[PDB]
Amino acid sequence: YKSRLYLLWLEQKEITKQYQTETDYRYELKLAHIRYDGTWNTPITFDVNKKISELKLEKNRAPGLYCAGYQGEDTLLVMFYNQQDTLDSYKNASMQGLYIFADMASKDMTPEQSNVYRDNSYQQFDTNNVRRVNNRYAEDYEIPSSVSSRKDYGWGDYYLSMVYNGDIPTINYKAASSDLKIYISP
Amino acid sequence: IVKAGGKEQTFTADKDVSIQPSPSFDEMNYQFNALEIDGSGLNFINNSA
Amino acid sequence: WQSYRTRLNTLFARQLVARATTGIDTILSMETQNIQEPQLGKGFYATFV
Amino acid sequence: ASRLAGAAADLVPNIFGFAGGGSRWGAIAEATGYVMEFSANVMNTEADK
Amino acid sequence: ASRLAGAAADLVPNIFGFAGGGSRWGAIAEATGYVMEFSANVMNTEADK
Amino acid sequence: DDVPLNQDYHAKVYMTFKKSPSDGTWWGPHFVRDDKGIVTINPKSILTHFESVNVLNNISSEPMDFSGANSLYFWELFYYTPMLVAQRLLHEQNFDEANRWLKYVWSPSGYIVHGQIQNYQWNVRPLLEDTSWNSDPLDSVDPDA
Amino acid sequence: QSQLNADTVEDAFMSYLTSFEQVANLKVISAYHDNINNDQGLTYFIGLSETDAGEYYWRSVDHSKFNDGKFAANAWSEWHKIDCPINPYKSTIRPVI
């Protein structure tokens, strides 16, 4: 995320429920990142237990998990796969995920938005008999929102004149099948 | 001037600059409304171009 | 305070980590020096000649 | 970082479900305390170095 | 080895049966904490040696 | 404002000559927020003081100000630190290293990025355009200040 | 030190960077103003460091130094650490003179 290594992991705590005494489990997601010096920062903790209960329990199992960074967007994408059955291609399955910003602030990923990333990044993690690795998430093409650095420059003919750094404030793009239109506002 | 694929494209200021800056030696700024650029080509090299 | 808006915080570090991935030379280079920061308001930028 | 992690994790409830957490309230202060002493010693070593 | 065995054993439930374990949550952090300090002094002794 | 205090003119910016102070007569250029969302200068917008006034759009970003609130730490990373490191390399006579570390602050033709030399002699920007990082230094006798 | 291998110096720089990133990324939770009305006096702020426990830093700005419609940067004060173990929820903390 933002060129720094982060890791996310999930811890389960035994909690008893009140006239009935029952073993119950609470799950919490935890985040950490590595500082410049090489020392790992404080683990910051998010409660995603609410989102976990809703995925089919199947007691004594571990939710499939997805971590990635989105290039164009500030946010980091975290998702919870449902139980993933032995076969793959299980689209349309409900995913409950979470948007985590740079600021440690976090916003809940809506199921509709969840389906977007679900659609572009499935098959990246799968069930028993295989373990799987997440690539960085991109919809079609990966391209900058903006460009502001002189990759090259040439001086005027007589050294009296020049073109000083001016930037490309906005870049947008639209994907078509085998066709691409890309828009610039120099 | 823009180069992608096999076709050069060109975008002159008179046509694409909505408002033009007062003439000054110090600094002059041209803002271009939008520019359209062809895709596929350019042809990708090792998935990057 | 009244009309005026004063920035209190910086996002420099968050962007800096991307610069740090490369050598420390890049960290002390000027592309790093012109790193941008959010507007903190409604947003209106005017050039007065 | 570690002494702080110890404070935060020991601020959440230990015991469940019928009786409350018993979480050690002053854990934070205590971690601050260790961080104090380890600061002094760190200093001494650098000085000695 | 010792500080870690201590952490793992203090992450399993202490208290039973009617109310839950009370296992110290930050124990891993804390053993890491000890391992840090003792590492420092080892280095110092090695240096002195 | 999210709630415009005036409909015709969202914000009024006017210029005053020390010889001529004046206001409220619609004289300075008036800027109106255009919904969803751009801003444009609105006639009559008497102007007359300015050579020209250009609204900047697509731009919501400012280069970090060494005049700023967080300025001390910026100076301290970019200027003071290479200096303290450099001179501390001098005292121990690592001439090559000390030259690299001075170079992060000043270099005759030491600056090549992406394969071409560039216009800056000083990598620390605030020196390039003079920056009043301290105003009122004579309060206490301080060479730094 | 006497011996300055490039490794030792780059490392010391990374160590400075790390101490720098904590101050850089703070969150202004709340503030206070010492004088009666806004025009004058010096305002104080409190900030939070992203860490499992809240470490709070306070900086102050003088208003008299706000001369021409912009803050002097003279007015601005270095952040100061606070030794007190503080745990307020949710953001109920406020400073006062």
Q: 3-state SS of chain C? A: CCCCCCCCCCCHHHHHHHHHCCCHHHHCCHHHHCCEECCCCCCCEEEEC
* Chain C with chain G: Cβ pairs closer than 8 A: 28
Cis-peptide, bond into residue A2, ω within 30° of zero: no
Phi and psi for G11 in degrees, rounded to 5? -60, -45
- Inspect the structure and tell me whether chains C and E have 3 or more CB pairs less than 8 Å apart: no
- The most distant pair of C-alpha atoms in chain A lies apart, rounded to whole Å, by 91
State how far the Cα of F131 lies from the Cα of F126, in Å rounded to an integer. Answer: 6
| G68 Cα distance to chain centroid | 24
State how far the Cα of A55 lies from the Cα of A43, in Å rounded to an integer. Answer: 25
> Residue F110 is encoded by which pair of tokens?
């030491």
Q: How close is the nearest chain C Cα to the Cα of F11, in Å?
A: 10
- Answer for the pair G52, D7: CB distance below 8 angstroms, yes or no: yes
Query: What is the DSSP code (8-state) at residue E13?
Result: -
> Residue A178 is encoded by which pair of tokens?
């085998």
Rg (CA), chain G: 18
State how far the Cα of A125 lies from the Cα of A116, in Å rounded to an integer. Answer: 16
The 3-state DSSP class for residue A158 equals coil
* Pairing state between β C36-37 and C45-48: unpaired
State how far the Cα of G72 lies from the Cα of F68, in Å rounded to an integer. Answer: 8
State how far the Cα of F79 lies from the Cα of F76, in Å rounded to an integer. Answer: 6
Phi and psi for F44 in degrees, rounded to 5? -65, -40
Among chain G, residues having any CB pair with chain D shorter than 8 Å are 1, 51-53, 83, 85-87
State how far the Cα of F40 lies from the Cα of F28, in Å rounded to an integer. Answer: 14
Q: How close is the nearest chain D Cα to the Cα of G52, in Å?
A: 6
Amino acid type, A11: E
Contacts of A166 in chain B (CB under 8 A): 29
Amino acid type, A165: N
**Residue written as token pair 């592309």:** C31
Contacts of D5 in chain E (CB under 8 A): 26, 29, 32
State how far the Cα of D6 lies from the Cα of E3, in Å rounded to an integer. Answer: 14
Nearest to A96 by CA among A31, A51, A126, A65: A51
Buried b / exposed e along F1-28 (16+ C-beta atoms within 10 A) = eeeeeeeebbbeebeeeeeeeeeeeebb
The 3-state DSSP class for residue D28 equals helix
- Answer for the pair F3, F18: CB distance below 8 angstroms, yes or no: no
State how far the Cα of F112 lies from the Cα of F109, in Å rounded to an integer. Answer: 8
Nearest to B33 by CA among B17, B15, B20: B17
> Residue D33 is encoded by which pair of tokens?
């305390």
- Cβ-in-10-Å burial (0-12, 13-18, 19+) of G51 comes to middle
F61 conformational bin, left if phi > 0, alpha if psi -120 to 50, beta if neither: beta
- Answer for the pair E20, A16: CB distance below 8 angstroms, yes or no: yes
Cβ-proximal residues to G8 (8 Å cutoff; 6+ apart), any chain = G1
The 3-state DSSP class for residue B46 equals coil
> Residue F17 is encoded by which pair of tokens?
């000559």
CB atoms within 10 A of CB G46: 22
Nearest to E13 by CA among D26, D16, D18: D16
- Cβ-in-10-Å burial (0-12, 13-18, 19+) of F30 comes to buried
Residue G28 forms beta bridges with which residues?
A: G47
Phi and psi for G47 in degrees, rounded to 5? -135, 155
- Answer for the pair G58, G82: CB distance below 8 angstroms, yes or no: yes
Alpha-carbon distance values, A6 to A34, A76, A138, F41, G53 (Å)? 7, 10, 19, 47, 19
State how far the Cα of F101 lies from the Cα of F110, in Å rounded to an integer. Answer: 12
Cis-peptide, bond into residue E20, ω within 30° of zero: no
Amino acid type, F121: Q
State how far the Cα of F45 lies from the Cα of D10, in Å rounded to an integer. Answer: 64
Alpha-carbon distance values, B42 to A182, F96, F138 (Å)? 11, 45, 61
PDB resolution in Å: 3.5
Cis-peptide, bond into residue D17, ω within 30° of zero: yes
DSSP strands (E only) in chain A: 6-17, 22-33, 44-46, 64-69, 76-81, 96-100, 106-109, 171-176, 179-184
Contacts of A160 in chain B (CB under 8 A): none
Four-point Cα dihedral D7, D13, D14, D19, nearest 10: 150
> Residue G13 is encoded by which pair of tokens?
């720089």
Query: What is the DSSP code (8-state) at residue F106?
Result: B
**Residue written as token pair 């967007």:** A73
**Residue written as token pair 């001439």:** F95
**Residue written as token pair 């202004």:** G28
CA atoms lying within 13 Å on the CB side of residue G16? 18
The 3-state DSSP class for residue A28 equals strand
Among chain F, residues having any CB pair with chain C shorter than 8 Å are 1-2, 11, 13, 15, 31, 33, 39, 50-57, 59-65, 68-70, 74, 78, 82, 104, 113, 120, 123-125
Query: What is the DSSP code (8-state) at residue F11?
Result: E
Residue C46 forms beta bridges with which residues?
A: F55
- Answer for the pair F30, F23: CB distance below 8 angstroms, yes or no: no
- Cβ-in-10-Å burial (0-12, 13-18, 19+) of F59 comes to middle
- Answer for the pair A27, A52: CB distance below 8 angstroms, yes or no: yes
Cis-peptide, bond into residue B42, ω within 30° of zero: yes
Contacts of A32 in chain D (CB under 8 A): none
Residues 30-49 of C with CB under 8 A from G: none
Q: How close is the nearest chain G Cα to the Cα of D16, in Å?
A: 23
**Residue written as token pair 């930028």:** C45
Residue A108 forms beta bridges with which residues?
A: A98
CB atoms within 10 A of CB G86: 16
CA atoms lying within 13 Å on the CB side of residue C8? 21
Alpha helices by DSSP H, listed for G1-97, are: 6-24
Nearest to G85 by CA among D37, D25, E29: D25
Alpha helices by DSSP H, listed for A25-120, are: 49-54, 111-120
Q: How close is the nearest chain C Cα to the Cα of G13, in Å?
A: 9
Cβ-proximal residues to E47 (8 Å cutoff; 6+ apart), any chain = none
State how far the Cα of D13 lies from the Cα of F15, in Å rounded to an integer. Answer: 63
State how far the Cα of B15 lies from the Cα of F63, in Å rounded to an integer. Answer: 31
